[PDB]
Design a protein around this ligand. Structure first.
Ligand SMILES: [Mg+2]
Ligand SMILES: [Mg+2]
Ligand SMILES: [Mg+2]
Ligand SMILES: [Mg+2]
Ligand SMILES: [Mg+2]
Ligand SMILES: [Mg+2]
Ligand SMILES: [Mg+2]
Ligand SMILES: [Mg+2]
Ligand SMILES: [Mg+2]
Ligand SMILES: [Mg+2]
Ligand SMILES: [Mg+2]
Ligand SMILES: [Mg+2]
Ligand SMILES: [Mg+2]
Ligand SMILES: [Mg+2]
Lengths: 75, 140, 145
RNA sequence: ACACCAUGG
RNA sequence: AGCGUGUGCCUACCCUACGCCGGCAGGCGCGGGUAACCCGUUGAACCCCAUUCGUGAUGGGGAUCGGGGAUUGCAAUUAUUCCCCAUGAACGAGGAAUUCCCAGUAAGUGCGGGUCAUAAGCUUGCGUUGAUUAAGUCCCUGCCCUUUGUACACACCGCCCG
RNA sequence: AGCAGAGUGGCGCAGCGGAAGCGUGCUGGGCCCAUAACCCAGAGGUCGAUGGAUCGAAACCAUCCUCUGCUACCA
């Protein structure tokens, strides 16, 4: 056991990294954003939904268990 | 009462009333203060010939000379609802072989008689015997 | 988003600011989680903001509800202490009122040496459990002499 | 193409 | 869904619909059933779909303990059972060893019978979602048949030498 | 009194600065129809005491104490 540090709401650096991580990924799930950033996970969900409301990402499958996104359906 | 507050001029009661007003209450007005079990035991509570305990407990708090105590009514009735009238008395409760005396305090209210006279000696252990461990068994 | 102070020291205990407010205030004794949801509901507070997102005036609105529940219309069957044995009141003992009320209750029991008082004294099991093969704290004994 | 295997109210 | 049980011959109790009251356990009222006729089209759990939590002994886990409210009974204290608020322990896949199992089987999951005034962490049955691995061998623990050796026959847990 | 060696788990001991274990014993369990042998868990520590160096020691340095072997054997 260790201390997996995580934030519940963003700091400006992390908010920049979110609005710039979109193209970098071809797999956008709450888990991967919660691990590559220091995000609680209930925060990664809200942030991903916020981005999706901006058309910045494309939802490829949502389930009660697991959610996924994609890059831009481009390129 | 034997302390600064418990049913005193300074504030402590039973359920919000004084022992003096409790002796001025009837079983019906009184059972609304008792907890659920004693309420059921009085609601259902014809108390058929448990009344000998109540009588003999009086008629013995009366013959008591002033500034003294009554001697010992002694009984097998271990499940008797302690009522505000039984207070101050001197009772011997059957253990299973002895009668153990119990002076009644006001704080004993609503508890049971048998709850003050335990049926066994508390254990303290000897040394383990020849069968105590799975290793211990062997004699030539 | 919302980068102001989070941790708050509600009466005598450190309520962490991160957890959801419902599961945040449960760090108070005497206040489980089923009671907390009722307190927050009667306080009109949103139930999707952490402890860090409440200003200094809502928290008093919540405290005064936790302390005086009977009057904010939280029924008399939620309160953990009922017809209190010494004076007939109904209330939630909160933080050290819980410790003292347990202490006073055990003293009350031992004083007239009820069968439960002696069990609390001797340090045994107070309800009706068998004790032959349970609890079992002490050290092993050997048959050797 | 062979390690160690004693004893019995 | 499937197997079932249901007014009791002394004995003295049965399964419950539907209305109303109460947060809950429960209470009152008024019908059906001696049963493919009524409970009952037995609206079972896991599963299925959607929301909150986020690797933290945490909302995992639910021991121990305080206070209160009902039902059974002649009687509930050493708390019968049941409900509510509160308290929130060990436990982060378990050493040497060792148990059961081959297809609707192992396991997960709930439901009836028995005991039963009240009442399963038991047992006896029932369905429900439903795998991985084998089609073998005599190695281990044992079993059956033949040949062979014995100083054993209370029979190798035997007998016996200094 | 002197020299040399040692002082660590009940007992024998290992431990060339990044710091507590080994053999045996004790308590308990495993294996077997039993018992010994054999297998595993647990408890048990002022690392002789006192100061100092070192970023840090049981270990290095200084003083003292306690055991063992050998000579000295000393009004
Ligand atoms: Mg043998
Ligand atoms: Mg011998
Ligand atoms: Mg011999
Ligand atoms: Mg019983
Ligand atoms: Mg069953
Ligand atoms: Mg029954
Ligand atoms: Mg049953
Ligand atoms: Mg049985
Ligand atoms: Mg054969
Ligand atoms: Mg022959
Ligand atoms: Mg022969
Ligand atoms: Mg012979
Ligand atoms: Mg013989
Ligand atoms: Mg032999």
């Amino acid at each position: 056991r260790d201390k997996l540090n995580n934030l519940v709401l963003f700091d400006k650096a992390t908010y920049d990294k979110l609005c710039k991580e979109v193209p970098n990924y071809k797999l956008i799930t709450p888990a991967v954003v919660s691990e590559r950033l220091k995000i609680r996970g209930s925060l990664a969900r809200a942030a991903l939904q916020e981005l999706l409301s901006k058309g910045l990402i494309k939802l490829v499958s949502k389930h009660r268990a697991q959610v996924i996104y994609t890059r831009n359906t481009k390129g | 009462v034997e302390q600064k507050k418990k049913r005193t001029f300074r504030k402590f009661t039973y359920r919000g009333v004084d022992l003096d007003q409790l002796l001025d209450m009837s079983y019906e007005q009184l059972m609304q203060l008792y907890s659920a079990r004693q309420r059921r035991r009085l609601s259902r509570g014809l108390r058929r010939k448990q009344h000998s305990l109540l009588k003999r407990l009086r008629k013995a708090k009366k013959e008591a000379p002033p500034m003294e105590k009554p001697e010992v009514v002694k009984t097998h009735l271990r499940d008797m609802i302690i009522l505000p009238e039984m207070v101050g008395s001197m009772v011997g409760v059957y253990n299973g072989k002895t009668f153990n005396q119990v002076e009644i305090k006001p704080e004993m209210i609503g508890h049971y008689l048998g709850e003050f006279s335990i049926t066994y000696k508390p254990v303290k252990h000897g040394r383990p015997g020849i069968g105590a461990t799975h290793s211990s068994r062997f004699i030539p | 988003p919302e980068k102001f102070q989070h941790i708050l020291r509600v009466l005598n205990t450190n309520i962490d600011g991160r957890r959801k407010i419902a599961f945040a205030i449960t760090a108070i004794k005497g206040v489980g989680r089923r009671y907390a949801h009722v307190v927050l509901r009667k306080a009109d507070i949103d139930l999707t903001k952490r402890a860090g997102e409440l200003t200094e005036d809502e928290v008093e609105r919540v405290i005064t509800i936790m302390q005086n529940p009977r009057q904010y219309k939280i029924p008399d069957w939620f309160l953990n202490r009922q017809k209190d044995v010494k004076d007939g009141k109904y209330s939630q003992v909160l933080a050290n009122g819980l410790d003292n009320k347990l202490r006073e209750d055990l003293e009350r029991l031992k004083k007239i040496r009820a069968h439960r008082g002696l069990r609390h004294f001797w340090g045994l099991r107070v309800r009706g459990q068998h004790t032959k093969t349970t609890g079992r704290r002490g050290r092993t004994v050997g048959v050797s002499k």
